[PDB]
Design a protein around this ligand. Structure first.
Ligand SMILES: [Fe+3]
Ligand SMILES: [Fe+3]
Lengths: 266, 268
């Protein structure tokens, strides 16, 4: 298979986006200050299937997540390049800590967009991207500890019930401060953690606004939401999302979500 | 001549209406709801009294209790919606529920497909793809051709997406009484008609869609105590509930749990 190509965030989001569209995945090195990941990680530790812990409700868990990570400029630049023309505004499907314990088995390689049934009714070679996943290692990702397996350049062929054997796929190997980005059409799966320590990443899933988020955030206190940026509030569902035709979704009282509520931001 | 708008009495059961909807993209269901329930919703709607002389009014959950209880739970409508959405898509919920108050002087819309507003509809074959949306319109007063009754092109729901479908002036109108309903899909060519009368023509239009599509109309602003007087099904209709895809994956979940369980949401 082809290799998982890498780019430094210094090369600019358009360099990352270009590998994303040629390969369906890219590793972006030094995309964010390790101090931020370390702090989120600390917030998380203070707080299961296939020996893998999935933990969400990250908005309530880490101010650093609400402030720095949900606002990371490089990420939104890539997300805009993916979604704006074909789809319009975007927001979060879910933000989840993936804690992959030793003994976790590799996942069957798959396309994330199977979650939304319409992906099976559109030609992957031309359809809009329904999902972007950005995974930040909270510790080192290697092949031997379950680093995400990927099939580069698999994001345009036909939808299938079988794509590859996990054991044939290269692993995303990358450091705190880096991020892996792959699309809903990129064949991938969790790797096997054959090591003696957990492999922990923060996985943000973004998608067009016209797609219902998996993780609802209507439960966050409005006090806490009102310290976040307008962009971050929209990410967690507390804002109106417009389609590429400027059709407004998630409207309240027939007006933009923020105005109906009088929702303050920072 | 274009085909006529077929009708069936709700007493014939939802299979018969669904089968016409499958064949034609639209069906009129006669005596599907008790006219007195519609009258109740009409009193509420009037107690709160614009493009192309047509007034759109939303937020029906707050304005009318009969809407929340009787209309959002109408079993015949859910049977049809289940037959439309369950296998291909899964759970469904409301895009929006709107009063369409068409005032004297409104002009006939350009005939169109409602699913144009969902960008994915332009990437799927209309002949074979799932429906993205079902419109159900209850007349609050008589619909006739002369007062703007909805124009429809029966059997236009499997043709390719196009910039042009028909001239409004050639189209048959949905003519119906209080207690009836018009059901059509997001692929059926249709449009508001011209109200040449001197009285408003008022309908209540529900747009339902798969749960995996974001509703245009959010209801996170309805007081929780109102929502808790509603059935679990009506609560899901207005977005206060987890919706499951045809593969049973859950969306609109909270703390990785069912929306209701996570919240302690009481229901009627
Ligand atoms: Fe996955
Ligand atoms: Fe329409």
């Amino acid at each position: 298979m082809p290799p998982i190509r890498r780019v430094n965030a210094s090369q600019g989001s358009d360099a990352a986006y270009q590998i994303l569209q040629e390969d369906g995945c890219v590793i972006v090195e030094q995309v964010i200050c390790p101090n931020i990941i370390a702090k989120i990680s600390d917030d998380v530790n203070r707080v299961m299937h296939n020996r893998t812990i999935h933990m969400g409700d990250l908005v309530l868990t880490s101010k650093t997540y609400r402030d720095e990570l949900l606002n990371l400029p490089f990420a939104h630049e890539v997300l805009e390049k993916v979604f704006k023309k074909d789809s319009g505004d975007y927001w979060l499907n879910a933000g989840v800590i993936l804690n992959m314990l030793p003994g976790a088995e590799a996942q069957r390689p798959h396309r994330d967009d199977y979650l939304y049934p319409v992906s099976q009714h559109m030609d992957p070679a031309t359809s809009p991207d329904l999902m972007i996943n950005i995974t930040f290692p909270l510790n080192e990702f290697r092949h031997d500890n379950g680093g995400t397996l990927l099939l580069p350049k698999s994001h345009t062929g036909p939808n299938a019930d079988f794509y590859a054997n996990a054991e044939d796929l290269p692993a995303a190997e990358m450091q705190v401060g880096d991020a892996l980005i792959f699309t809903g059409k990129c064949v991938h799966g969790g790797g096997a953690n054959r090591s003696d320590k957990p492999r922990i990443g923060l996985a943000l899933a973004a998608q067009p606004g016209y797609l219902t988020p998996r993780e609802s955030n209507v439960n966050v206190p409005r006090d806490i939401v009102e310290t976040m940026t307008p962009l971050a509030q929209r990410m967690i569902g507390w804002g109106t999302v417009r389609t590429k035709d400027t059709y407004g979704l998630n409207m309240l009282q027939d007006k933009d979500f923020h105005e109906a509520l009088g929702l303050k931001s920072k």
